[PDB]
Amino acid sequence: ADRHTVFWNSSNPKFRNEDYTIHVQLNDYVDIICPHYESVADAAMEQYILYLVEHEEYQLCQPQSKDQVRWQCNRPSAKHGPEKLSEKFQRFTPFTLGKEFKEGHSYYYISKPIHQHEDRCLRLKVTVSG
Amino acid sequence: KEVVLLDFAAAGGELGWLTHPYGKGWDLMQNIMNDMPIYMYSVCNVMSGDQDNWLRTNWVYRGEAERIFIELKFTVRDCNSFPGGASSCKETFNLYYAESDLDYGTNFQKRLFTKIDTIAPDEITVSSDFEARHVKLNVEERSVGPLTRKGFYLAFQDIGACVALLSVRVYYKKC
Ligand SMILES: *[C@@H]1O[C@H](CO)[C@@H](O[C@@H]2O[C@H](CO)[C@@H](O[C@H]3O[C@H](CO)[C@@H](O)[C@H](O)[C@@H]3O)[C@H](O)[C@H]2NC(C)=O)[C@H](O)[C@H]1NC(C)=O
């Protein structure tokens, strides 16, 4: 009713069109859920760096800099459950390294695999309505 | 030597502190600082008038502790830096505590809490600090004593400020 779930993995069919976009309101949460396993081989477990980027980096599906690193899916078999990035679409942050989100704007996530095949570009468009 | 009873930053975001009112005030936020994954409780209800938001730590077993020392690290945003910015913007928050024999779990009654002090930033985060990605991290310490009951909670009350709490460290000194 309030939070949106995205399964960030290369088997998620929603990424196939590369038009994957979800619509949120201010103060909605997006829960990006990292690949998670409890047995395939360690090397087969999907791992990603998530970036939060501007439109152009989204078009290229490539990060511009370290500053854009949002989170890391580098715990594919954590016992405590899947690793999870919970982004609240606030208008204002007290934290100077975080992002602010505005009504009528769109925001963009991309990933890169951690030392693995990039078969397909994984990206997400989040549009704030209002 | 210092014996640590609570260390938020060390817990890797697994702590799950109670907030009140339910799902309205403080939120657990996540970020990258110094190329490391970090967590913080933050609140920024500066446009909404009268705010009364509580973050309560989990119950801390006292043991042999008599005087505890509480180390807070946090940021606070310049009330001037809000496009709107109602005269309901504050630049402080309050630190409370309560002693208990048992863990009350999901029960939270504010009036059981005693105010320790108002917490104010030495360094205010200004709008230019955003494009410069400059984190001005305040450090504040308080102590309460003598503790007498089997355990205690700390709580943080926001009254309409834009705050991010990055660290909460409680310890006593042995000898
Ligand atoms: C990769 O993304 C997949 C989604 O495209 C994800 O599959 C999803 O797995 C979750 C939880 O494991 C399922 O959620 C449901 O789980 C059970 C099913 O009855 C119930 O508790 C709930 O109804 C709950 O919503 C999804 O149904 C499932 N979706 C699909 C299409 O299979 C994978 O788990 C992700 N893979 C990895 C490696 O993490």
Side-chain angles (χ1 to χ4, degrees), chain A residues 1-16 18-78 80-98 100-119 121-130, chain B residues 2-23 25-49 51-110 112-149 151-173 175:
Chain A
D2 190 32
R3 30 206 329 142
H4 313 256
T5 304
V6 177
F7 291 88
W8 206 284
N9 72 66
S10 79
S11 290
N12 187 342
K14 298 194 179 153
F15 284 114
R16 176 149 62 246
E18 307 186 353
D19 60 354
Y20 192 9
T21 140
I22 69 189
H23 299 260
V24 306
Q25 276 165 109
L26 271 187
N27 302 334
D28 272 3
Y29 301 81
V30 170
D31 289 328
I32 295 168
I33 299 197
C34 294
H36 188 255
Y37 309 80
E38 64 252 306
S39 254
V40 318
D42 294 342
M45 295 175 184
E46 287 182 24
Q47 290 189 61
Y48 298 98
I49 302 164
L50 300 169
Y51 301 90
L52 171 67
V53 298
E54 248 91 299
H55 186 90
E56 219 211 33
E57 347 300 353
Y58 171 89
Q59 290 294 69
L60 297 182
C61 204
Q62 283 180 12
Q64 181 198 236
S65 84
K66 192 219 326 175
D67 299 350
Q68 295 177 317
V69 177
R70 188 58 187 95
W71 203 250
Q72 297 203 76
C73 297
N74 64 350
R75 287 168 56 189
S77 68
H80 293 237
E83 185 71 32
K84 180 184 77 173
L85 189 280
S86 294
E87 184 85 84
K88 186 186 189 171
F89 285 69
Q90 278 175 312
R91 208 267 159 261
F92 298 111
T93 353
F95 197 62
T96 220
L97 271 29
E100 298 194 323
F101 302 93
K102 293 136 94 169
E103 285 185 54
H105 290 65
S106 283
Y107 301 87
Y108 312 94
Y109 297 85
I110 66 172
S111 63
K112 290 296 174 184
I114 304 176
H115 322 300
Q116 286 169 338
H117 289 346
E118 197 184 2
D119 280 4
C121 152
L122 300 174
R123 56 190 202 176
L124 210 221
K125 176 165 186 188
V126 192
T127 299
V128 187
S129 47
Chain B
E2 306 176 355
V3 180
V4 183
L5 294 168
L6 186 71
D7 197 332
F8 174 78
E14 293 173 323
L15 281 193
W17 288 351
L18 173 157
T19 55
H20 173 83
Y22 153 77
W26 308 80
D27 266 296
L28 183 72
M29 302 305 189
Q30 57 203 125
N31 246 300
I32 306 296
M33 188 172 65
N34 306 301
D35 316 322
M36 299 286 163
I38 69 165
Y39 295 77
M40 63 196 76
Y41 280 107
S42 90
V43 62
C44 195
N45 291 343
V46 296
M47 308 289 221
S48 321
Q51 290 296 308
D52 189 15
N53 301 306
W54 294 74
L55 175 72
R56 191 211 60 182
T57 69
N58 298 147
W59 193 65
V60 180
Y61 184 87
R62 176 174 78 76
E64 57 164 29
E66 273 169 47
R67 175 161 292 275
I68 53 153
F69 292 84
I70 304 158
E71 188 196 76
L72 301 190
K73 303 178 179 168
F74 61 97
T75 63
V76 183
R77 189 163 163 178
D78 187 354
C79 282
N80 291 312
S81 67
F82 297 107
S87 81
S88 62
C89 186
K90 303 276 194 302
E91 286 172 351
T92 76
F93 65 99
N94 300 310
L95 167 66
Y96 282 80
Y97 85 104
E99 290 197 68
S100 231
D101 286 331
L102 23 61
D103 196 340
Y104 299 119
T106 54
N107 287 338
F108 178 75
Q109 169 63 292
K110 340 150 44 191
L112 290 182
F113 284 75
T114 309
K115 188 172 169 168
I116 302 181
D117 203 9
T118 299
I119 310 298
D122 288 352
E123 281 185 297
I124 256 286
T125 296
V126 304
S127 74
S128 77
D129 290 330
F130 284 83
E131 82 104 83
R133 305 189 94 241
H134 180 187
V135 187
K136 283 168 163 148
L137 192 64
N138 299 284
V139 182
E140 287 291 341
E141 199 170 312
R142 303 290 182 280
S143 63
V144 68
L147 298 186
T148 158
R149 313 201 88 83
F152 70 89
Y153 299 100
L154 307 183
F156 309 92
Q157 186 203 27
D158 158 56
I159 41 159
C162 195
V163 183
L165 232 196
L166 296 245
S167 191
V168 180
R169 192 170 147 269
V170 182
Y171 65 95
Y172 69 98
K173 303 171 183 194
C175 283

